[PDB]
Ligand binder design. Structure first.
Ligand SMILES: [Ca+2]
Length: 97
């Protein structure tokens, strides 16, 4: 009967300056209204590993700083209390200088 969460959405700055801190907004819903945890990749090797639980539909804002030039693929997936996992939402963030 249980369904996995929907794929998370990630919004925030897609270009910035190396060393400056930026805020990213994450949110998804679970079809059953279940609480969920998020697994975030910042694209640079750092992660947030199943943070939460949070309410279904609650926007959660986390900041990050990249300290090397590059193009970083920020990704987020979610799983409900029964550990049924979503696919990944993604946002590409460029740090040119
Ligand atoms: Ca569910």
């Amino acid at each position: 009967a249980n369904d996995p969460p929907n794929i998370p959405n990630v919004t925030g700055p897609t270009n910035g300056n190396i060393g400056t801190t930026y805020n990213y907004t994450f949110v998804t819903t679970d079809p059953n209204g279940d609480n969920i945890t998020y697994y975030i990749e910042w694209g640079d090797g750092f992660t947030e590993e199943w943070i939460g639980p949070y309410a279904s539909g609650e926007e959660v804002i986390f900041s990050h700083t990249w300290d090397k030039k590059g193009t970083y693929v920020v990704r987020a997936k979610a799983k409900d209390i029964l550990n049924y996992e979503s696919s990944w939402g993604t946002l590409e963030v460029t740090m040119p200088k």
